[model samples]
Target chain A: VLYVGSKTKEGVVHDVTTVAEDTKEQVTNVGGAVVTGVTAVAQKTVEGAGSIAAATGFVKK
Target chain B: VLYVGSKTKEGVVHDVTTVAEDTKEQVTNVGGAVVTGVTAVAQKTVEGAGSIAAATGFVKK
Candidate 1:
């Protein structure tokens, strides 16, 4: 759970997309099977991005 | 986009699961149509939980 993002909106976006794509890659390796974790993984990505966005004043908290 | 979580692992788990479940609900309303955004949303959840975990010393950044 060591998700990394910066103190900026652009950085937030980059980090979110990076981690997300990485997770998707894992799913791909599994042949896109019904991996329950994918749902959770994407869920975290949204939260992470939102957190950074709020911290960086990119959105309202 | 205003996903909320606290500075604890418990909170992280709660928020991540909460948002993920909420997003799943959205999918359910749509009949689980292959909504591409779910992938991105889950990505942010993982990243968000990771970010806060790192910030709160729950994990290494």
Candidate 2:
């Protein structure tokens, strides 16, 4: 998440939300600050598939 | 990730499911007025000595 605050502001001035279609590019929040920097965080996988098998080892029994 | 419903509803609606800690977050498919809301999001961190390095990109190359 991107945190934006001016000198006059205090404590988490503004929060911006946006969806990233491509994982390679940096993601900016609603206020246009790059939150997801140059380095990738996680790969963009299939949408609506909640069970991330690699992250969660145990499969559905 | 928050939505609530009011007034005449149509199409896919109302699904709630949970799993043990092993399970990942559920992907919801719903039709509602304000389907969901967020008091806070994305602040929680993981437990155990599993792999912070991997997440923060300091894995042994």
Candidate 3:
């Protein structure tokens, strides 16, 4: 189970829980606003083994 | 797979076809003024791999 951490323009990190089949759109949305960044560390709980990916899209103010 | 391609402000890349289990606020949203002072780049699918990495915060109308 992958979880999006924090949304930011500086890229995102992934948190994984046992490698599973995933999609790009599942991680990154269309408009390009990430919820989290990718994580490379091993998780203790079964919920931390997922991956985190960032999106591409300039922030508009 | 790791996809989050773009999200402006600097940093956001990594597309993997295997080793699933991904997360990160499923890209969605668009805000922020026209980013300036920083070097710009062309527009295209799977673009801006290498160009510039400017400084930080600076905005206005």
Off by over 4 Å in 2: A1-7, A19-56, B1-61
Top candidate on lDDT is: 3
Q: How is the predicted docking of candidate 3 categorized under the CAPRI scheme? A: incorrect
Clashing pairs in 2: B2-B35, B2-B36, B2-B37, B3-B34, B3-B35, B3-B36, B4-B34, B4-B35, B5-B33
Residue B54 of model 3 has an lDDT of: 29
Output the better candidate (2/3) by DockQ.
Answer: 3
Fnat: each model in turn = 0.13, 0.00, 0.17
What's the C-alpha lDDT at position A15 in model 1?
27
Instruction: Report how far off residue A50 is in candidate 2 (Å).
Output: 23
Better of 1 and 2 by lDDT: 1
Write one digit per residue (lDDT tens) for candidate 3, span A1-61.
2224433334322322234445344322233433322233222223221332333444434
Compute each candidate's TM-score over C-alphas. Answer: 0.14, 0.15, 0.17
Question: Looking at model 1 chain B, which ten-residue stretch has the lowest summed lDDT?
Answer: B52-61
- Cα lDDT tens digits for candidate 1, A1-61: 3424322121121122212321222211111122222232323224234322111101111
CAPRI verdict (incorrect, acceptable, medium, high) for model 1: incorrect
Q: B16, model 2: CA deviation in Å?
A: 25
